[PDB]
Amino acid sequence: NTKRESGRKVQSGNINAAKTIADIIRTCLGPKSMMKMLLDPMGGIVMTNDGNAILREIQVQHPAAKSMIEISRTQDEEVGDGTTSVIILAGEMLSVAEHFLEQQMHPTVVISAYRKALDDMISTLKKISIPVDISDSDMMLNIINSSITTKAISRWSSLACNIALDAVKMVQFEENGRKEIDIKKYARVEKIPGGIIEDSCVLRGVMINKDVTHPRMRRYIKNPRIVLLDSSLEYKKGESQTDIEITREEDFTRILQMEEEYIQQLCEDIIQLKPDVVITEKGISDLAQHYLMRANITAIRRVRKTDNNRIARACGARIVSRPEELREDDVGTGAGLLEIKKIGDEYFTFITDCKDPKACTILLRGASKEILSEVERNLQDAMQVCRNVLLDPQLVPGGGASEMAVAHALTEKSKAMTGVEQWPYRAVAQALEVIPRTLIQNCGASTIRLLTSLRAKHTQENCETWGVNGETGTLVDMKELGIWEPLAVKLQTYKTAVETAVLLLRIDDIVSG
């Protein structure tokens, strides 16, 4: 209707909800960590390492309480890390720079400031980013065990170091670009209920829970053939559409079985033709699928063409309309390894597949049901470095120190930059140093004078390489110490944080509509 809201007050509204999120999960961040308690109106205990998890479970305000979920979900989609870091950078910087600058009267040179304090940030980061080798799971270790401990897991880290570090190398985009950096399709995280670390095998390919579900389904034909319909089955799973009337009671039942009978007559054709495998993408219900077990066939059902066709290239199968129909092998053997490791009688097919499009499902087993999701997040936190190291051998030792390396060198360039520019530059560059000094808080002692000396040490000796760690709160070489800050991480965590900054700096009104 007719309503007008204004600028810095709306900017403050952008400051407020975010400024709250900038705190606890910043404490929860890094080697000095916390938990965010959530009081349910009934009193239920909730504590996480993610405040957006707490936000989803409680009131969320239309201001950046909504957005700091969003842009962290944006941060959650990309590298799968730094969501904890984005919430605490953005609202902070927006709480830091704006007032100092808007009293000088401008978002304008602040508009330029975030990408300028991004510039050297991105710049000297890549420059002090230390090459760490891809060929070695050990020289991929110190970086990936650092990345999986950014969320504070060494538990399945080393095991995520085992499986995933070579797995993203086995992740291929079928565009034949990278590959090296991999979005999650060609690399997926999928788990098996229960199990054990040896029931976890390094699995670099797709894993179909539906390839072998049951023992009467296919058993170790090392190169199956996945039949999609078309002859061995057909394009009809239909309904004969029988006329109906109130006087015919048997007439209600015939139309019910008719959906299954066509599903049956296709599987009956499968009983006749008998592949080792059929993929039914229209899907087959329990009835006709119980008929494929007597034919010595697996029934792969209600999966997707993309996965199947990749599974085909992944497991050594291919789409052929009949088993008796034999045309040619697009993949004679497409498998690095074929496994089925069962928990209970329900079978789970592990097909280890090297540089296939596949799913690169990386088998992740907790000791039991519950910590599976740990191994999932860890093998996910794994593939982050795995796609970072393989893309970028350079990645900065740091994250206490890299956060220092950025901050102190930034305003250090104001010494070079100066101008009116320096003022919003440093002000958007101010908030960064505090992140380790926020963790150096829980190191006890003096969180300030340490970083102070470390800030001196920054340009004095070295910056992110030799610098502050959240574990130490003091100077160590983050390389020698083995604490690593993936290069792909810092390019993002700040970005989406400063992306929300200029935006919420530039969004000056909220209309009623």
């Binding site: 209707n1 600028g7 034949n176 002859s231 045309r327 009104d509 909220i510």
Partner: protein, 534 residues
């Protein structure tokens, strides 16, 4: 509202419903001011506690806004209808439209008779109509130092992300001049709609590869039929070959699965028979718009085939128009025994395909029905091309907007803030109530830059210091030349000497808003007899 609240419905009984409208007009204009243009900050528009949107557009917010005020009513449509006119003046009309209805009715009420004051907000706009149409002075892209090339460049160098204006000084020229098509607005104009431009991932972060003729979008790995034979001719096809289903449907009325596959397998082989006729006619390369499924791919992989399929119709359309081929001259059927025709042959010096960046395009060289170019934007990623392409389109558009009009007006209010004190002194010229009438508008050509440069935080009182530094008794002059720089470049907040940049707008978009400026004013007057409805 204000005034008596017990009679609803825009009876506030007196100027209370005039002022509550002008203060709403001012208020509804307060939305768009800080929204004005790109320097006008994006608003985050709450549509609900769970629904928002972020726009600085003047006509986007007000379509979403509710207005029960008559002056707030006329303001939303003016943002919208001038958007409906162009989209230049979504923001522009809004600011003064608050003022002129506030400026109009005041003297209209004073009447010697209300007819006198009506022109005062038309007359200066009319005197702006001439002045605006008197502008070739800034925005002219056709007159550069490099002409179109700098018209490209300066418009690229306005949105410049990079070497835009280096190789891209060439491209906007190349893009508009690769276009032979019948879309014309007024004077002859070449569509930037028909430009065939595709993205590169890798190699150069910024480069523009200029290739002769149209380059058809294509990819390797999605077709098992080898699609590549070097030749001088292509076959542009609106047509399909699919082994799964081409002429085939499904049967839910038939119980027998035998009935589906018996009519299915016939269509699989005739695809391999049809490719032979499309090939052997004239064409070693055959361009097919109809596709094949990834399953069907397997069928065309292991049964084999030849064709170039799944290719964009828009290109294959433009190619056959360019290359003298025909998109469909022959097939009324999908049959494999149906012969293919030689008119669909692309007339080209060669049929070649450059795969680069891991991105392949089908190059039709020397298209003989008309000239063409498909310019390949080199990014290291595909979204680098959009930053180019967004810089390109508006560069394309502003040149196309100079292809809209010869007379063209400067971006920014140095056009307005000139006539401002010109015509606010022209207030005095006629004097009387017209010095009131003419000034009320001509005082308001000051305010748009006061929004403009302040959206850049330049304190436009400093800009109008620079503006009316140009704006003189010695320079009253739109001319076609600058003894005063009438340009105000809105990517800055202060004038820049670019007249070819992409920020400027043609004379078409402005004289429109001049009506819209005066439109909020007298549209609300003609009513008589304010009443109350039970």
């Amino acid at each position: 509202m204000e005034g008596p609240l017990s009679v609803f419905g825009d009876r506030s009984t007196g100027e209370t419903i005039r002022s509550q409208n002008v203060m709403a007009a001012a208020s509804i204009a307060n939305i768009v001011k800080s929204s004005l243009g790109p320097v006008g900050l994006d608003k985050m528009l709450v549509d609900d506690i769970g629904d928002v949107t972020i726009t600085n557009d003047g006509a986007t917010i007000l379509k979403l806004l509710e207005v029960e005020h008559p002056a707030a009513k006329v303001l939303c449509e003016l943002a919208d209808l001038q958007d409906k006119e162009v989209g230049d003046g979504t923001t522009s009309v809004v600011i003064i439209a608050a003022e002129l209805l506030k400026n109009a009715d005041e003297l209209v009420k004073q009447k010697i008779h209300p007819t006198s004051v009506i022109s005062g907000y038309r007359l200066a706009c009319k005197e702006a109509v001439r002045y605006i149409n008197e502008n070739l002075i800034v925005n002219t892209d056709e007159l550069g130092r490099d002409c179109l090339i700098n018209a490209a460049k300066t418009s690229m160098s306005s949105k410049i992300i990079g070497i835009n204006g280096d190789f891209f000084a060439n491209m906007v020229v190349d893009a508009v001049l690769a276009i032979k098509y019948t879309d014309i607005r007024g004077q002859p104009r070449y569509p930037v709609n028909s430009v065939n431009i595709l993205k590169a991932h890798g190699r150069s972060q910024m480069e523009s590869m200029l290739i002769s003729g149209y380059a058809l979008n294509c990819v390797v790995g999605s077709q098992g039929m080898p699609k590549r034979i070097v030749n001088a001719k292509i076959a542009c096809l609106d047509f399909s070959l699919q082994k799964t289903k081409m002429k085939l449907g499904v049967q839910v009325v038939i119980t027998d699965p035998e009935k589906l596959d018996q009519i299915r397998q016939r269509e699989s082989d005739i695809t391999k028979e049809r490719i032979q006729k499309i090939l052997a006619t004239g064409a070693n390369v055959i361009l097919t718009t109809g596709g094949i499924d990834d399953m069907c791919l397997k069928y065309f992989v292991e049964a084999g085939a030849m064709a170039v399929r799944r290719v964009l119709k828009r290109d294959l359309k433009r190619i056959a128009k360019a290359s003298g081929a025909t998109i469909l001259s022959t097939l009324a059927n999908l049959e494999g025994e149906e012969t293919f025709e030689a008119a669909m042959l692309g007339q080209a010096e060669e049929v070649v395909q450059e795969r680069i960046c891991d991105d392949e395009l089908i190059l039709i060289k020397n298209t003989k029905a008309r000239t063409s170019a498909s310019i390949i934007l080199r990014g290291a990623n595909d979204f680098m091309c959009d930053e180019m392409e967004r810089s390109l389109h508006d560069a394309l558009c502003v040149v196309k907007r100079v292809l809209e009009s010869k007379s063209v007006v400067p971006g920014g209010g140095a056009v307005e803030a000139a006539l401002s004190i010109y015509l606010e002194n022209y207030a005095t010229s006629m004097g009387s109530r017209e010095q009131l009438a003419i000034a009320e508008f001509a005082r308001s050509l000051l305010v748009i830059p006061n929004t403009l440069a302040v959206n850049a935080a330049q304190d436009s009182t400093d800009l109008v210091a620079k503006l009316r530094a140009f704006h003189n008794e010695a320079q009253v002059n739109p001319e076609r030349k600058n003894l005063k720089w009438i340009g105000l470049d809105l990517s800055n907040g202060k004038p820049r000497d670019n007249k070819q940049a992409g920020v400027f707008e043609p004379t078409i978009v402005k004289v429109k808003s001049l009506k819209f400026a005066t439109e909020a004013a007298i549209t609300i007057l003609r009513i008589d007899d304010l009443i109350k409805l039970h």
